[PDB]
Design an enzyme around this catalytic site. Structure first.
Site, mmCIF file in Angstrom:
data_model
loop_
_atom_site.group_PDB
_atom_site.id
_atom_site.type_symbol
_atom_site.label_atom_id
_atom_site.label_comp_id
_atom_site.label_asym_id
_atom_site.label_seq_id
_atom_site.Cartn_x
_atom_site.Cartn_y
_atom_site.Cartn_z
ATOM 1 N N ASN A 1 -0.103 9.204 1.747
ATOM 2 C CA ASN A 1 0.704 10.356 2.140
ATOM 3 C C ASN A 1 2.041 10.398 1.399
ATOM 4 O O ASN A 1 2.091 10.711 0.198
ATOM 5 C CB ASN A 1 0.909 10.403 3.662
ATOM 6 C CG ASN A 1 -0.328 10.863 4.400
ATOM 7 O OD1 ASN A 1 -0.759 12.017 4.266
ATOM 8 N ND2 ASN A 1 -0.908 9.965 5.192
ATOM 9 N N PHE A 2 3.111 10.077 2.120
ATOM 10 C CA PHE A 2 4.463 10.180 1.596
ATOM 11 C C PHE A 2 5.273 8.936 1.980
ATOM 12 O O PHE A 2 6.515 8.955 1.992
ATOM 13 C CB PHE A 2 5.122 11.470 2.105
ATOM 14 C CG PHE A 2 4.357 12.728 1.757
ATOM 15 C CD1 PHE A 2 3.370 13.225 2.612
ATOM 16 C CD2 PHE A 2 4.628 13.422 0.575
ATOM 17 C CE1 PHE A 2 2.657 14.394 2.288
ATOM 18 C CE2 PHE A 2 3.922 14.595 0.245
ATOM 19 C CZ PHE A 2 2.937 15.079 1.102
ATOM 20 N N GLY B 1 0.799 -1.202 0.000
ATOM 21 C CA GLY B 1 0.000 0.000 0.000
ATOM 22 C C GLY B 1 0.832 1.251 0.000
ATOM 23 O O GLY B 1 2.057 1.206 0.123
ATOM 24 N N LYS B 2 0.140 2.371 -0.152
ATOM 25 C CA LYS B 2 0.750 3.690 -0.118
ATOM 26 C C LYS B 2 -0.220 4.649 0.559
ATOM 27 O O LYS B 2 -1.304 4.245 1.002
ATOM 28 C CB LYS B 2 1.140 4.150 -1.534
ATOM 29 C CG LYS B 2 2.468 3.557 -1.997
ATOM 30 C CD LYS B 2 2.776 3.774 -3.482
ATOM 31 C CE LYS B 2 4.195 3.297 -3.794
ATOM 32 N NZ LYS B 2 4.519 3.245 -5.259
ATOM 33 N N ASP C 1 -7.237 8.764 11.523
ATOM 34 C CA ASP C 1 -7.544 8.188 10.210
ATOM 35 C C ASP C 1 -8.234 6.821 10.288
ATOM 36 O O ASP C 1 -7.941 5.906 9.512
ATOM 37 C CB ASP C 1 -6.276 8.098 9.357
ATOM 38 C CG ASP C 1 -6.583 7.990 7.866
ATOM 39 O OD1 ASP C 1 -7.622 8.529 7.426
ATOM 40 O OD2 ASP C 1 -5.776 7.378 7.137
HETATM 41 C C1 LIG Z 1 -0.844 -0.145 3.480
HETATM 42 C C2 LIG Z 1 -1.139 -0.211 4.987
HETATM 43 N N1 LIG Z 1 -0.756 -1.535 5.496
HETATM 44 C C3 LIG Z 1 0.031 -1.763 6.576
HETATM 45 O O1 LIG Z 1 0.523 -0.854 7.228
HETATM 46 C C4 LIG Z 1 0.248 -3.168 6.941
HETATM 47 C C5 LIG Z 1 0.926 -3.694 8.006
HETATM 48 N N2 LIG Z 1 0.860 -5.057 7.971
HETATM 49 C C6 LIG Z 1 0.121 -5.472 6.888
HETATM 50 N N3 LIG Z 1 -0.239 -6.668 6.419
HETATM 51 C C7 LIG Z 1 -0.976 -6.750 5.322
HETATM 52 C C8 LIG Z 1 -1.393 -5.605 4.648
HETATM 53 C C9 LIG Z 1 -2.228 -5.741 3.398
HETATM 54 C C10 LIG Z 1 -3.356 -4.732 3.157
HETATM 55 C C11 LIG Z 1 -2.071 -4.665 2.322
HETATM 56 N N4 LIG Z 1 -1.037 -4.412 5.098
HETATM 57 C C12 LIG Z 1 -0.296 -4.311 6.197
HETATM 58 C C13 LIG Z 1 -2.638 0.014 5.304
HETATM 59 C C14 LIG Z 1 -2.857 -0.058 6.821
HETATM 60 C C15 LIG Z 1 -3.097 1.402 4.852
HETATM 61 C C16 LIG Z 1 -3.537 -1.037 4.639
#
Ligand SMILES: C[C@H](NC(=O)c1c[nH]c2ncc(C3CC3)nc12)C(C)(C)C
Ligand SMILES: NC(=O)Nc1ccccc1
Length: 276
Positions: A18-19, A15-16, A129
């Protein structure tokens, strides 16, 4: 708690926002593909403002210890190492498994999110958020709050935070005081939690999403949304939503932050509904 970068092997983007970006990596010190998977957050902006924010984000998550908050694993020196939850975000999980998840299950998720937020509040942490897209699924019966990129610690003598820059999140999760005055608190988190309840009970169906409803209800969008909310307009009860769940939503959406229930007050109520 310290991970060597050479041992973190890039797999894909998670994921992404902000920055920063979150990547799926394998922590593979044997270099044989047998290592464990981790989610790794990093910045892509050298700016001291962002780097200081990321440093703060790491300190916050490191000090959070909850079954209902994404687990800090460590750092690499620049990168934040977290547990990887392959079931992904709740938003996508709900959309995919819609036909398997009954109202009890939704109430279970609601209760777990509430408990995490209760803990977060006890640490003087405002999430800022909260949304189904920022909640991760550990298992069929276990969710965890993630995305601490905007999280703030409240000073001991002050129960609210004012942000200088305008918000960059979809506007439909913001409390009116955030929309109007950039004011964030544990009670604006309650407002957003009300919207999370809405997401859960619509199963994040796009056609009745917060955005879809606003375009139906109908000058800048943010100003229009403020007006609608000031007028007392709210999101409608999700299709087949239990009345009591909808009532709790509306209480979370009390116009004055002081009139919204606390997470500690919401918790027992959600547990009662889950048992009933
Ligand atoms: C990309 C961020 N993800 C994380 O910080 C994550 C920390 N452990 C994770 N495990 C799986 C995922 C899958 C959903 C992609 N994201 C995260 C967010 C919370 C916005 C989904
Ligand atoms: N809290 C709440 O009801 N927000 C809202 C209202 C109308 C349209 C979209 C979102």
């Amino acid at each position: 708690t310290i991970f060597e970068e050479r041992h973190l092997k890039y797999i894909s983007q998670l994921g992404k926002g902000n920055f920063g970006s979150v990547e799926l990596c394998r922590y593979d010190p044997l270099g044989d593909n047998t290592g464990a998977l981790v989610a790794v957050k990093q910045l892509q902006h050298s700016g001291p403002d962002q780097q200081r924010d990321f440093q703060r984000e790491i300190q916050i998550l490191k000090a959070l210890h909850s079954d209902f908050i994404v687990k800090y694993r460590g750092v690499s020196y620049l990168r934040l190492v977290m547990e990887y939850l392959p079931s992904g975000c709740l938003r996508d999980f709900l959309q995919r498994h819609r036909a398997r998840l009954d109202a009890s299950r939704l109430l279970l998720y609601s209760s777990q999110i509430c408990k995490g937020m209760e803990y977060l509040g006890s640490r003087r942490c405002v999430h800022r958020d909260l949304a189904a897209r920022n909640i991760l699924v550990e298992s069929e019966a276990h969710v965890k709050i993630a995305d601490f990129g905007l999280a703030k610690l409240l000073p001991l003598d002050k129960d609210y935070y004012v942000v200088r820059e305008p918000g960059q999140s979809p506007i439909f999760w913001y409390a009116p005081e955030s929309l109007s005055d950039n004011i964030f608190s544990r009670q604006s988190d309650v407002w957003s939690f009300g919207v999370v309840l809405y997401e859960l009970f619509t199963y994040c169906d796009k056609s009745c999403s917060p955005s879809a409803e606003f375009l139906r209800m109908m000058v800048p969008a943010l100003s229009r949304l403020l007006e609608l909310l000031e007028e007392g307009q709210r999101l409608p009860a999700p299709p087949a939503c239990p009345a009591e769940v909808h009532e709790l939503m509306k209480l979370c959406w009390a116009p004055s932050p002081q009139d919204r229930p606390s997470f500690s007050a919401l918790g027992p109520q959600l547990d009662m509904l889950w048992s009933g």
